[PDB]
């Protein structure tokens, strides 16, 4: 149709199943609008937690003539999900891993119909993989990509009738991304190493035993996997 998405969200859109998209913390509803204009989905829910983004989403849905196709809802995380909703995809993008984790954990009662989850994490994706484990979700695909110099991970997960246990390396680096180790995987984790060694330039070893132990273990893990 008419909206242009960035590569990050375009990449998320390629994982959408037909039917309904619920986009939590929606980008002025541009992902739901894009999905309906490109016939990826036929119905949308756009969840917003504050009034500014809420009103911007309402205006954007009206401007694209999709008032009867996209429901814009105010509420925190999955609280926007209503018991009558039939949802094929939940998308949670442009957030840190720990916040996506919290939204899924705190809203876990909302996942009873076992939608596909497409999560796009800006940092600390480990926490989201740990939560997906706890909710009987299984990672079926992962992408790591770069846009304007920032490295982003997309995690695609579906329900499993048995809990899938991931190793400490699989939770930290991704069970699919480990199989690749593309230029963006290397760049992300070289940059994390640089940042961890830089923190060591600022912490006296006499005074920060606890944090340095954690930092040194993380460096050792990354140096083994690269």
Give the whole-angstrom CA distance, residue 7 versus residue 93. Answer: 13
Residue set of the binding site: 8, 76-77
By C-beta, is 128 or 170 nearer to ligand SAH? 128
Min. distance of Cβ 193 from ligand SAH in angstroms? 27
Min. distance of Cβ 98 from ligand SAH in angstroms? 12
Residue set of the binding site for S-adenosyl-L-homocysteine: 8, 76-77
By C-beta, is 111 or 170 nearer to ligand SAH? 111
Min. distance of Cβ 5 from ligand SAH in angstroms? 9
Residue set of the binding site for S-adenosyl-L-methionine: 8, 76-77
The answer to whether 84 and 62 are in contact (CB under 8 A) is: no
Give the whole-angstrom CA distance, residue 72 versus residue 118. Answer: 19
List interacting residues with ligand SAH (CB under 6 A).
9, 24-27, 47-50, 53, 76-77, 93-95, 103
Min. distance of Cβ 161 from ligand SAH in angstroms? 29
SS3 70: strand
By C-beta, is 107 or 175 nearer to ligand SAH? 107
């Amino acid at each position: 149709g008419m909206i242009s998405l960035n590569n990050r969200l375009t990449t998320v859109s390629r994982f959408l199943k037909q039917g309904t998209i619920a986009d939590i913390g929606s980008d002025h509803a541009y992902l739901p609008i894009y999905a309906i204009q490109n016939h990826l989905c036929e119905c949308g829910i756009a969840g917003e937690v504050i009034q500014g983004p809420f009103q911007a989403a309402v205006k954007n849905v009206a401007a694209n003539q999709l008032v009867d196709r996209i429901d814009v809802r105010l509420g925190d995380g999955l609280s926007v999900i209503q018991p009558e909703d039939v949802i094929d995809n939940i998308t949670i993008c442009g957030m840190g891993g720990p916040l996506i984790a919290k939204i899924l954990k705190d809203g876990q009662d909302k996942l009873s119909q076992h939608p596909r989850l497409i999560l796009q994490s800006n940092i600390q994706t480990e926490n989201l993989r740990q939560t997906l484990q706890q909710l009987n979700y299984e990672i079926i695909d992962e992408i790591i990509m770069e846009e304007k110099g920032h490295i982003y991970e997309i995690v695609v997960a579906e329900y499993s009738t048995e809990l899938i246990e991931l190793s400490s390396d699989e939770l930290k680096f991704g069970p699919k991304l480990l199989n690749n180790k593309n230029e963006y995987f290397i760049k992300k984790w070289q940059r994390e190493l640089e940042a961890l060694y830089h923190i060591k330039s600022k912490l006296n070893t006499e005074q920060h035993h606890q944090r340095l132990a954690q930092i040194n273990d993380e460096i050792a893990v990354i140096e083994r996997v690269l």
